[PDB]
Amino acid sequence: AISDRRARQSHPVLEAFISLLSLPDSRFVSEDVLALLDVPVLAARFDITEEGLRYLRQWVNESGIRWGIDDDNVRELELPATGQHTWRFGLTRMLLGYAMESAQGEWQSVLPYDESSGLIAELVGHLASLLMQLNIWRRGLAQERPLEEWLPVCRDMLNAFFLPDAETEAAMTLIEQQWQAIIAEGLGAQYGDAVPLSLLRDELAQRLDQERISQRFLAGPVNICTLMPMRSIPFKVVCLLGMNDGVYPRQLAPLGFDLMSQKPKRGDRSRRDDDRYLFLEALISAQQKLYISYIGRSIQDNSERFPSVLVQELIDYIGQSHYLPGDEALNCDESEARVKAHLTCLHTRMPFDPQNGKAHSEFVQPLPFTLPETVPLETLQRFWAHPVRAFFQMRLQVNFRTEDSEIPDTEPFILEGLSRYQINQQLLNALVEQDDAERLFRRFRAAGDLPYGAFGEIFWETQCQEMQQLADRVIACRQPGQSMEIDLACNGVQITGWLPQVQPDGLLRWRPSLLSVAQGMQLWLEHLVYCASGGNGESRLFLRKDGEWRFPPLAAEQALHYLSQLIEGYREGMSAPLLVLPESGGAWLKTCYDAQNDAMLDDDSTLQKARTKFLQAYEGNMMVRGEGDDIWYQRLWRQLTPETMEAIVEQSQRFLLPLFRFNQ
Amino acid sequence: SYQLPESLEKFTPRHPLFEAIDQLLAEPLSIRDLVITRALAEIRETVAREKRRRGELGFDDMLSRLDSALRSESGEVLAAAIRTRFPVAMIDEFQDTDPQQYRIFRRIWHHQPETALLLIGDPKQAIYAFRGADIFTYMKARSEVHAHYTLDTNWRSAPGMVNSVNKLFSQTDDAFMFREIPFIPVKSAGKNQALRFVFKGETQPAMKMWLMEGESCGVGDYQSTMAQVCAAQIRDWLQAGQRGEALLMNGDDARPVRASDISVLVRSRQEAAQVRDALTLLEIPSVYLSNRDSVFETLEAQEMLWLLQAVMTPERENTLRSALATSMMGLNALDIETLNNDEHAWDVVVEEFDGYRQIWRKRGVMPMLRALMSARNIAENLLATAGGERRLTDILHISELLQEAGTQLESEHALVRWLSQHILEPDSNASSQQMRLESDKHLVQIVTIHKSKGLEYPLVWLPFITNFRVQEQAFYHDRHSFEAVLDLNAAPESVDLAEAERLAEDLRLLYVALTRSVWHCSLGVAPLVRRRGDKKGDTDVHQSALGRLLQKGEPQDAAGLRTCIEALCDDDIAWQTAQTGDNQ
Amino acid sequence: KLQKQLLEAVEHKQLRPLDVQFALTVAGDEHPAVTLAAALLSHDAGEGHVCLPLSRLENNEASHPLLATCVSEIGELQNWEECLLASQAVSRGDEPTPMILCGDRLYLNRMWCNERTVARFFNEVNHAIEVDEALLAQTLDKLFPVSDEINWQKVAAAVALTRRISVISGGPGTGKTTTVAKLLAALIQMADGERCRIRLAAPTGKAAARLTESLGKALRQLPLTDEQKKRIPEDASTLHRLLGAQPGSQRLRHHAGNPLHLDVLVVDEASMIDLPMMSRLIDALPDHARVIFLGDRDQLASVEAGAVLGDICAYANAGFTAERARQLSRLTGTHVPAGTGTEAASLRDSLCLLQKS
């Protein structure tokens, strides 16, 4: 039974109430607005469901809402009126996106939002109504007024926002009673002027966090309570905690200008003397046993601590009043040392050491599986992009999802990652058709993902330059063509899918990325299926940093054999976790194998060179991550052994030899 | 640049405008100075205004708040009242003497007599400059105070070590380019005047330095190849100690050398990886004491976020299956495959997580989490695995941190966003560090210089104490005003003054490195030349710390350094050449 | 302003927060007629109307003091076409404008795009496919047992094999499954060399099950070669599953950029399909495919927003054309009725009907 706790039962209603009463200075961070929406009573007031909460979350994330509410809010704090990344802008964008489609173009320098078009859009209206109510109270609560006019605003706010229920009725009555009591005292003392809201805010906070509960001190089980002042009860066993230095007794400095602190008298009551009297009272209140503990060793760096003067005096008196039965008459000081060593026991640092099981089975297991008849092409593509990830995320339907992150704190001043990768891809796809870039620039400036003005202009001017530098050698070998359907059969397995940009010369792609063995294998798979479905012709793919993958035309029998090998590998790999690293194994095979002799020079010097390159690929520099560092590989193994290293090398060689065979 | 009278004449006025370009190419041009100056005051003003408006106060702010009141004339009654109540003052160690604090002390107790002040200081070793400690405050403070005292007795190490640290600094006077810090005469103790370290028959001298063969090789070459030499000597010492060849002895009593007390020190965190491979190749595991890595960076926090959030979402079957596949939970592919198809085995875990959510909503994180730690029989099962006890500590550390998080925060759902917020940026604060595990036995300990204060070490190793790193940003202290003058431009006259301080601090840290090693100390050296070529007849180590004091303030070469190394060798410098080989 | 006027309606439960917020945030502070029209358009679009005619809004004259509302500024605003055309939020399809007024009734841009796509798909895509008429007649007299008079099942088979896109309408208990089984058998007997991938679909699962079992019984009743019954399709799928509808996303796995490959497709019960599903199905159809439509006009069509079946089947009352009537008189060997008039040649050709229960 734990007594003397603080009165706090319905915590989130009070926390939301005080946060909402901290209104007229808030900057309206979207994280705080979602924190407001998280309350179930507030959600049920405006008929918003937990299913719709996820839609609201991803919509607010994708829209781009970071700052305060309106133009008055952004101009009140003396900032330039950017006219963007505000709640009004986001809601206007979302409503216009409900009205039309996004590809048709901008209307008022606002790009409409594609997602919300169905029967889900009532959340937009509910959110807008809530925002309007918040803005109304933001304008309302700013001004000062006398106490008799500050009286009803608490009840008005409560009935304005919170949906009533019998469960939270106690909390509502508590808030109303405390607010009425504070204003009743203020009016009964006959004040006349006005008050800012911060005084009432922090006074109500301290008054709500003041009440305690001292009900169950004698429930019947073991009692846990503070050292209660003015108390002395006999008991059989008494135990204490926290007797170190600087904590007991309490060290309270006076107010600094007290009068009685300079002229002491008889009836004084200091906390230090009160604690030092209560210690002796607790000592004499025992009847059978006693138990005193403190903290001797700091857990941080194995430094030293000390117990308090009370227990130091107690153990000194115990030592100086008694002696051991064994060494009866040797010396007083050695008797002191031996008794003090006898009465003190110590405990081990961790609570699992024996001084105070069966191992984990391996995760890899043989698994039954039956091969289906028809497989899509893109399923093979997503499998062979990363086979371990595929085995986790399509065979047994788990995904180690990095969960939905928090809203970024501001508008992006500079662009990296996918946020510029899709921009680069869109710009290259626009520039390969020799169309105007100014229209798409206006489209992105309407969408709201560019720096304000000149910085965005300079960013566009350098990105367009680099994409045009790539696009010149892209367009140097352009030929018109169309798409076609792909249908082939191998090993009694139907393969169907689509493939774009088929021309009499062959195939052609472009991507604003870096050259890689994964991209080589992607183009390899597409070229093999194209050549296996008839169609004499080579293939080409240019990338950034002057890379190139190019493969000669092949024969139908060899193409069918290679697709058969890949299909059988996929069939084996989705049931048994086939392990292939498409970067480290690729670098190892590039170092090990020479294409001119069509053989591997297998001396130990080149083996060590290939091992060094493989280890550098597995663990890269301190400026980029390594392929070996990834969540799937960490779940597979916690460390690397040469047995698995040899298995990886062998399997990667067997399944990636044709790539370096036909590469040129 | 070649259109100047100072250029073309040495390589006629020739125009009246020909002297104008010489004006505009002697002083550079930018906007950076104005932008930085306009930024610096306003950021400090704005953050102070916001702190005052919200009602908080900083530990870095209370000192400045006291200083203004003491500087103003309103608080003379305060200045009298504090000296009335506290008529004595002593200061611990005095190296982190901030100018804010020294102004207070000099204004209060330097005058107003019959109230004395004491000062205890250790004028060197100065290794809190990155925290904010300034040595120029002590430099100014030495002038006004009259009396000066010094203590000599070590009570700690060998007379050979005391003679080594006395002999190493007698080549040149004013070894730190400062007249304001004196010479270092230290006398050894008398109780322990017979500390001897004996190995393989004959004894062993105090300092053993390792000279690098070659002309122009980087210390990266040592860290790649010859960093294994120190590990080889360490392995030889341990194998000899366990076979009774090496000894550690005082007087006539002796003890064998354990595999624990030998330590090695480095400068930066990067070369810890460069020295770890040199030791794990020879098959000696090594414990790391500079582990400033936060606990939040490991796999366990990433798994813990999924495990805790699956309790928050006990119905969404896609994200519920994240936790059961973790390495903490410990299931298999056949274990998940038989549960995906079955409905009732899926239905079993629903109430188990529902009760967990109720326990969390009723009591707290610890009653919720320890129930899961106890129910599934996981702590015992991790112990049977290889090193599961190593991983198990982090769960309890994270669980402890969640309590101090949840006593401050009151929103139940916001603890998840607190955790995901703290995951991203890895702060290097106090409570977010790891704990140590083993104490029955200890490996070779590796620790940085800064975290090596006030501890006794029998055997040390200082391999890479010959390399340097020059500074670029011009920021120096005036030789008279002792203020933090700042030139945002690139004046080489100020650059040299800012570079001499970097030269002195490396010498001070070198002196920090030698207050260790009760019995024996050892170190390495390498004649690295800055230019990429080798054969030029000069070096650049005299631009670093040790090279300047070994070259007596002159630029030399390998030929001028070879006999200079060997000249002062007498009974205390056991020098050996570089050994490109493996002993075992 | 009019904001308070619109906000008593939410307490009246006559409007929706979506509608009032959309109308306000689009109209702004123009004349109140624009705001009222916006609110009414949003509400009626939510209720199940594709569009709102101007006649209702300018002739009910009871939702306000319409005289003071309409007649407010210079000129006469009772010319509502000019009044809303002079506004900013309404245009004629050139600017990416929230409101479109083209066919003298205003509606949103999404309905306009879908309507124009449907009109283009029917009125400019239909192709007169060509095969051997003698082989058609031979297969007709080999398979259809009726050879005495003109039979509407034979006429339906003739027109369905005639045109790439066709619509069949008729009541229950008229052997529609038997007729489409006859069409499938005739097509499979016609095409032997080239592959013919056939898939079936339905708006709902019970209709899919009914269609599959009825077609199975019909094909077991009418015998063919084992290879023919092998090439007979197996099962049907729901149209949402056929397009691959993600539970969360609105991006489809069979959008226009990834067209589903399929030779022919039979769709039953089109009266339970509104206009957007027709639009997205048109988006996901390759060029060389043939689609047959089934349904009934006399039953209750979609009185809510979007009923393509009734408004297309209404044009069938004009009749056939003389060229196709004579061609099918040649093919069937009987007297095929002919029609007059001219509305749309291919569309009027591609509407058959039944007259026997």
Coordinates of N, CA, C and O in Angstrom, one line a residue, chain A residues 55 58 88 92 95-101 104-108 113-118 120-126 128-129 132 378 485-487 496-498, chain C residues 3 7 16-19 21-22 25-26 42 45 88-89 93 95-98 108-111 113-114 195 197 247-251 258-262 286 288:
Chain A
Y55 N -5.2 8.8 -42.0 CA -5.4 9.6 -43.3 C -5.0 11.0 -43.0 O -4.3 11.6 -43.8
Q58 N -1.0 11.2 -42.7 CA -0.2 11.1 -43.9 C -0.6 12.3 -44.8 O 0.3 12.8 -45.6
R88 N -4.1 27.5 -43.5 CA -5.0 27.9 -44.6 C -4.6 27.5 -46.0 O -5.4 27.1 -46.8
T92 N -6.6 24.9 -48.3 CA -7.0 25.4 -49.6 C -6.5 24.4 -50.7 O -7.2 24.1 -51.6
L95 N -8.6 21.2 -50.5 CA -10.0 21.3 -51.0 C -9.9 21.5 -52.5 O -10.8 20.9 -53.2
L96 N -9.0 22.2 -53.1 CA -8.8 22.3 -54.5 C -8.5 21.0 -55.1 O -8.9 20.7 -56.3
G97 N -7.7 20.2 -54.4 CA -7.4 18.8 -54.9 C -8.6 17.9 -54.9 O -8.7 17.0 -55.7
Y98 N -9.5 18.1 -53.9 CA -10.8 17.4 -54.0 C -11.6 17.9 -55.2 O -12.3 17.1 -55.8
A99 N -11.5 19.2 -55.5 CA -12.3 19.7 -56.6 C -11.8 19.2 -58.0 O -12.7 18.8 -58.8
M100 N -10.5 19.2 -58.2 CA -10.1 18.8 -59.6 C -8.9 17.8 -59.5 O -8.6 17.2 -58.4
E101 N -8.3 17.5 -60.7 CA -7.1 16.6 -60.7 C -5.9 17.5 -60.7 O -5.9 18.7 -61.0
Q104 N -3.9 18.8 -64.4 CA -4.5 19.8 -65.3 C -3.8 21.2 -65.1 O -3.9 22.0 -66.0
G105 N -3.1 21.4 -64.0 CA -2.3 22.6 -63.8 C -2.7 23.4 -62.6 O -3.7 23.1 -62.0
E106 N -1.9 24.4 -62.3 CA -2.1 25.3 -61.2 C -3.2 26.2 -61.5 O -3.5 26.5 -62.7
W107 N -3.8 26.8 -60.4 CA -4.9 27.7 -60.6 C -4.6 29.1 -60.0 O -4.6 30.1 -60.7
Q108 N -4.2 29.2 -58.7 CA -3.8 30.4 -58.1 C -2.5 30.3 -57.4 O -2.3 30.6 -56.2
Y113 N -4.1 18.7 -54.7 CA -3.6 17.5 -54.1 C -4.4 16.3 -54.5 O -5.6 16.3 -54.4
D114 N -3.6 15.3 -55.0 CA -4.2 14.2 -55.8 C -5.1 13.2 -54.9 O -6.0 12.7 -55.4
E115 N -4.7 13.1 -53.6 CA -5.2 11.9 -52.8 C -6.7 12.0 -52.5 O -7.4 11.1 -53.0
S116 N -7.1 13.0 -51.8 CA -8.5 13.1 -51.3 C -9.5 13.4 -52.4 O -9.6 14.6 -52.8
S117 N -10.1 12.4 -52.9 CA -11.2 12.6 -53.9 C -12.4 11.8 -53.7 O -13.5 12.1 -54.1
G118 N -12.3 10.7 -52.9 CA -13.4 9.8 -52.6 C -14.3 10.3 -51.6 O -14.6 11.5 -51.4
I120 N -13.9 10.2 -48.4 CA -13.1 10.3 -47.2 C -13.0 11.8 -46.7 O -12.5 12.1 -45.6
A121 N -13.4 12.7 -47.6 CA -13.1 14.1 -47.4 C -13.8 14.9 -46.3 O -13.6 16.1 -46.2
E122 N -14.7 14.2 -45.5 CA -15.3 14.9 -44.4 C -14.4 15.3 -43.3 O -14.6 16.3 -42.6
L123 N -13.2 14.6 -43.3 CA -12.2 15.0 -42.3 C -11.6 16.4 -42.6 O -11.2 17.1 -41.7
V124 N -11.6 16.8 -43.9 CA -11.2 18.1 -44.3 C -12.1 19.2 -43.6 O -11.6 20.1 -43.0
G125 N -13.4 19.0 -43.7 CA -14.3 19.9 -43.2 C -14.3 19.9 -41.6 O -14.4 21.0 -41.0
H126 N -14.1 18.8 -41.0 CA -14.0 18.7 -39.6 C -12.7 19.5 -39.1 O -12.8 20.2 -38.1
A128 N -11.2 21.8 -40.7 CA -11.3 23.3 -40.9 C -12.2 23.9 -39.9 O -11.9 25.0 -39.4
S129 N -13.3 23.2 -39.4 CA -14.1 23.7 -38.4 C -13.3 23.9 -37.1 O -13.4 24.9 -36.4
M132 N -11.0 26.9 -37.4 CA -11.8 28.1 -37.2 C -12.1 28.4 -35.8 O -12.0 29.5 -35.3
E378 N 7.4 -7.7 -62.9 CA 7.8 -6.8 -61.8 C 7.9 -7.5 -60.5 O 8.7 -7.1 -59.6
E485 N 3.6 -5.8 -75.8 CA 3.3 -6.8 -74.8 C 4.3 -7.9 -74.8 O 4.9 -8.3 -75.8
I486 N 4.6 -8.5 -73.6 CA 5.6 -9.5 -73.4 C 4.9 -10.8 -72.9 O 4.1 -10.7 -71.9
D487 N 5.1 -11.9 -73.6 CA 4.5 -13.1 -73.3 C 5.4 -14.3 -73.7 O 5.7 -14.4 -74.9
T496 N 4.2 -13.0 -67.9 CA 3.5 -11.9 -68.7 C 3.9 -10.6 -68.0 O 4.2 -10.5 -66.8
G497 N 3.8 -9.5 -68.8 CA 4.1 -8.2 -68.3 C 4.3 -7.2 -69.5 O 4.1 -7.6 -70.6
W498 N 4.5 -6.0 -69.1 CA 4.6 -4.9 -70.1 C 6.0 -4.3 -70.0 O 6.8 -4.5 -69.1
Chain C
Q3 N -21.5 34.5 -44.2 CA -20.9 33.3 -43.5 C -21.9 32.9 -42.4 O -22.1 31.7 -42.2
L7 N -23.9 29.4 -41.9 CA -23.7 28.7 -40.6 C -24.9 28.5 -39.8 O -24.8 27.7 -38.8
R16 N -23.4 20.4 -45.1 CA -22.3 19.7 -44.5 C -21.1 20.6 -44.3 O -20.9 21.6 -45.0
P17 N -20.3 20.4 -43.3 CA -19.1 21.2 -43.1 C -18.1 21.2 -44.2 O -17.5 22.3 -44.6
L18 N -18.0 20.1 -44.9 CA -17.2 20.0 -46.2 C -17.7 21.0 -47.2 O -17.0 21.8 -47.8
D19 N -19.1 20.9 -47.4 CA -19.6 21.8 -48.4 C -19.5 23.3 -48.1 O -19.1 24.1 -49.0
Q21 N -17.4 24.8 -46.1 CA -16.0 25.2 -46.1 C -15.4 25.3 -47.5 O -14.7 26.3 -47.8
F22 N -15.8 24.3 -48.3 CA -15.3 24.4 -49.7 C -15.9 25.6 -50.4 O -15.2 26.3 -51.1
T25 N -14.2 28.9 -49.0 CA -12.8 29.0 -49.4 C -12.6 29.0 -50.9 O -11.4 29.4 -51.3
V26 N -13.5 28.7 -51.7 CA -13.4 28.9 -53.1 C -14.0 30.3 -53.6 O -13.4 31.0 -54.4
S42 N -22.0 21.6 -54.2 CA -21.3 20.7 -53.4 C -22.3 19.7 -52.7 O -22.1 18.5 -52.7
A45 N -23.9 17.4 -55.3 CA -23.0 16.4 -55.7 C -22.8 15.3 -54.7 O -22.6 14.1 -55.0
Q88 N -14.9 34.9 -61.3 CA -13.5 34.4 -61.4 C -13.4 32.9 -61.3 O -12.6 32.2 -62.0
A89 N -14.3 32.2 -60.5 CA -14.2 30.8 -60.2 C -14.9 29.9 -61.2 O -15.0 28.7 -61.0
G93 N -13.6 25.9 -69.6 CA -12.7 24.8 -69.8 C -11.3 25.0 -70.3 O -10.6 24.1 -70.6
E95 N -8.9 27.6 -68.7 CA -8.1 27.7 -67.5 C -8.4 26.5 -66.6 O -9.5 26.1 -66.5
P96 N -7.4 26.1 -65.8 CA -7.7 25.0 -64.8 C -8.6 25.5 -63.7 O -8.1 25.8 -62.6
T97 N -9.8 25.7 -64.0 CA -10.8 26.4 -63.2 C -11.6 25.4 -62.3 O -11.9 24.3 -62.8
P98 N -11.9 25.7 -61.1 CA -12.6 24.8 -60.2 C -14.0 24.4 -60.7 O -14.5 23.3 -60.5
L108 N -18.4 20.1 -61.5 CA -17.0 20.1 -61.2 C -16.2 19.6 -62.3 O -16.7 19.0 -63.3
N109 N -14.9 19.8 -62.2 CA -13.9 19.4 -63.3 C -13.8 17.9 -63.5 O -13.6 17.5 -64.6
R110 N -13.9 17.2 -62.4 CA -13.7 15.7 -62.4 C -14.8 15.1 -63.2 O -14.5 14.2 -64.1
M111 N -16.1 15.5 -63.0 CA -17.2 15.0 -63.8 C -17.0 15.4 -65.2 O -17.4 14.6 -66.1
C113 N -14.2 15.9 -67.0 CA -13.2 15.1 -67.6 C -13.7 13.7 -67.8 O -13.5 13.1 -68.9
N114 N -14.4 13.1 -66.8 CA -14.9 11.7 -67.0 C -15.9 11.7 -68.1 O -16.0 10.7 -68.9
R195 N -4.0 -16.6 -80.2 CA -4.5 -16.8 -78.8 C -5.7 -16.0 -78.5 O -5.9 -14.9 -79.1
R197 N -7.2 -14.8 -74.9 CA -7.3 -14.8 -73.4 C -8.7 -14.2 -73.1 O -9.0 -13.1 -73.5
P247 N -6.1 -1.0 -50.6 CA -7.0 -0.5 -49.5 C -6.7 0.9 -49.0 O -7.6 1.6 -48.6
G248 N -5.5 1.3 -49.0 CA -5.1 2.7 -48.6 C -5.0 3.7 -49.7 O -5.5 4.8 -49.7
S249 N -4.2 3.3 -50.7 CA -3.9 4.3 -51.8 C -5.0 4.4 -52.8 O -5.9 3.5 -52.9
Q250 N -4.9 5.4 -53.6 CA -5.8 5.6 -54.8 C -5.1 5.4 -56.1 O -5.7 5.5 -57.1
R251 N -3.8 5.0 -56.0 CA -3.1 4.7 -57.2 C -3.3 3.2 -57.5 O -3.0 2.3 -56.7
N258 N 0.0 1.2 -66.8 CA 0.2 -0.2 -66.8 C -1.0 -0.9 -67.2 O -1.8 -1.4 -66.4
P259 N -1.3 -1.0 -68.5 CA -2.6 -1.5 -69.0 C -2.6 -3.0 -68.8 O -1.7 -3.8 -69.1
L260 N -3.8 -3.5 -68.4 CA -4.0 -4.9 -68.3 C -4.2 -5.5 -69.7 O -4.9 -4.9 -70.5
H261 N -3.5 -6.6 -69.9 CA -3.5 -7.3 -71.2 C -4.6 -8.3 -71.3 O -4.6 -9.3 -70.5
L262 N -5.6 -8.2 -72.2 CA -6.7 -9.0 -72.2 C -7.4 -8.9 -73.6 O -7.5 -7.8 -74.1
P286 N -6.7 -1.9 -73.4 CA -5.8 -1.8 -74.5 C -6.6 -1.5 -75.8 O -7.8 -1.6 -75.9
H288 N -6.5 -3.2 -78.8 CA -7.0 -4.3 -79.7 C -7.9 -5.3 -78.9 O -7.9 -6.5 -79.1

